[PDB]
Chains A and B, each alone.
Chain A
Amino acid sequence: GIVEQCCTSICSLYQLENYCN
Protein backbone atom coordinates (compact mmCIF):
# COMPACT_ATOMS: atom_id res chain seq x y z
CA GLY A 1 0.00 0.00 0.00
CA ILE A 2 0.78 3.69 0.28
CA VAL A 3 1.17 4.13 4.06
CA GLU A 4 3.84 1.41 3.74
CA GLN A 5 6.34 4.08 2.63
CA CYS A 6 4.15 7.16 3.21
CA CYS A 7 3.80 6.16 6.87
CA THR A 8 6.46 3.53 7.63
CA SER A 9 9.01 5.23 5.36
CA ILE A 10 9.09 8.81 3.97
CA CYS A 11 6.37 10.24 1.69
CA SER A 12 7.66 12.76 -0.88
CA LEU A 13 5.52 15.09 -3.02
CA TYR A 14 6.83 13.40 -6.19
CA GLN A 15 6.03 9.94 -4.78
CA LEU A 16 2.36 10.87 -4.47
CA GLU A 17 2.50 12.56 -7.87
CA ASN A 18 3.06 8.99 -9.02
CA TYR A 19 0.16 7.89 -6.80
CA CYS A 20 -2.05 9.88 -9.20
CA ASN A 21 0.21 10.11 -12.28
Chain B
Amino acid sequence: FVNQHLCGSDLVEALYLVCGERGXFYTKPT
Protein backbone atom coordinates (compact mmCIF):
# COMPACT_ATOMS: atom_id res chain seq x y z
CA PHE B 1 0.00 0.00 0.00
CA VAL B 2 1.12 3.64 0.28
CA ASN B 3 2.28 4.63 3.79
CA GLN B 4 4.57 7.58 2.98
CA HIS B 5 4.28 11.40 2.94
CA LEU B 6 1.68 11.95 0.18
CA CYS B 7 0.64 15.46 1.34
CA GLY B 8 -2.44 16.98 -0.36
CA SER B 9 -2.06 16.29 -4.13
CA ASP B 10 -1.43 12.60 -3.32
CA LEU B 11 -3.26 12.13 0.01
CA VAL B 12 -6.28 13.76 -1.67
CA GLU B 13 -5.67 11.43 -4.64
CA ALA B 14 -5.96 8.37 -2.39
CA LEU B 15 -8.92 10.16 -0.81
CA TYR B 16 -10.57 9.75 -4.22
CA LEU B 17 -9.95 6.11 -5.16
CA VAL B 18 -10.63 5.50 -1.44
CA CYS B 19 -13.74 7.43 -0.34
CA GLY B 20 -14.27 9.53 -3.49
CA GLU B 21 -16.92 11.43 -1.49
CA ARG B 22 -19.26 8.98 -3.22
CA GLY B 23 -18.57 10.98 -6.41
CA UNK B 24 -15.36 12.82 -7.35
CA PHE B 25 -13.44 16.01 -6.46
CA TYR B 26 -12.12 17.44 -9.75
CA THR B 27 -8.67 16.78 -11.25
CA LYS B 28 -8.71 15.46 -14.84
CA PRO B 29 -12.15 14.30 -16.01
CA THR B 30 -10.91 13.40 -19.52
Contact = CB atoms under 8 A, between A and B. Distances in A.
Interface of A: 2-3, 6-13, 16-17, 19-21
B28 interface: no
Which 10 residue pairs are nearest across A and B when measured between Cβ atoms?
A20-B19, A7-B7, A6-B11, A10-B3, A7-B5, A3-B7, A11-B6, A16-B18, A13-B1, A12-B3
Interface in B1-30: 1-8, 11, 14-15, 18-19, 21
Contacts, number: 46
A6 B6 CA distance: 6
A11 B14 contact: yes
B25 to A, nearest CB: 11
